[PDB]
């Protein structure tokens, strides 16, 4: 009946080039998504409870 939730610090990486403050923010979150599309959806966490 338990529900164990695991969290682990992960260093993200952004591409060289793109400017503009808004565009950088979208990329910071794009990195959060690419992490989920390689570790998240395959283990357990949903698209709803996405941290950060």
């Amino acid at each position: 009946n338990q529900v164990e939730l695991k969290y682990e610090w992960v260093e993200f990486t952004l591409p060289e080039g793109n400017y503009s403050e808004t565009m950088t923010i979208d990329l910071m979150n794009n990195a959060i998504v690419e992490h989920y599309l390689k570790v998240g959806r395959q283990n357990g966490v949903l698209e709803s409870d996405i941290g950060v």
């Binding site: 998504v33 989920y36 599309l37 959806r41 698209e47």
Partner: peptide, 13 residues
């Protein structure tokens, strides 16, 4: 249908 794999990207419509 498979059952477990949501590309997570509104491809539709």
């Amino acid at each position: 249908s498979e059952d477990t794999f949501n590309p997570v990207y509104p491809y539709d419509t």
